[PDB]
Design a protein around this ligand. Structure first.
Ligand code: ZJE
Length: 121
């Protein structure tokens, strides 16, 4: 299964699944500083799933590893901003992270395999 390009549509489909998850609700658009006035005191690099989807559709990711780094940033930002490990939005982030990691592991594997096949000679 050595298609170097196949990761892109696989990531589009996984983002569609994440947008259907009720657990993505807090993470679907950049945080609003009116409601969370100190957010940018704590978080140096905001990230959200609409930004990830737009970057993918612009042709601004070279690899699924770069997409994976931005999606992991969504979850690290929620862990850094939460006042409690028992918070509602942090708890949603942990379930969504588990779902994402379960689905991205074949996308990464297949891509890295396809690039090794391309370099085989
Ligand atoms: O404002 C947003 N998200 C956009 C809105 C738009 C309507 C739904 O979501 N967020 C999500 C990320 N935050 C967190 O991870 C945490 C808050 C408390 C503990 S962690 C901050 C609040």
């Amino acid at each position: 299964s050595y298609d170097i390009q196949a990761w892109k549509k696989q990531c589009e489909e996984l983002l569609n699944l994440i947008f259907q998850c009720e657990d993505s609700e807090p993470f679907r658009q950049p945080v609003d500083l009116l409601e969370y006035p100190d957010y940018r005191d704590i978080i140096d690099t905001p990230m959200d799933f609409a930004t990830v989807r737009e970057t993918l559709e612009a042709g601004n990711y070279e690899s699924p590893m770069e997409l994976c780094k931005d999606v992991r940033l969504i979850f690290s930002n929620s862990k850094a901003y939460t006042p409690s490990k028992r918070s509602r939005i942090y708890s949603m982030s942990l379930r969504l992270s588990a779902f994402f990691e379960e689905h991205i592991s074949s996308v990464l594997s297949d891509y890295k395999s396809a690039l090794r096949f391309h370099k085989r000679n």
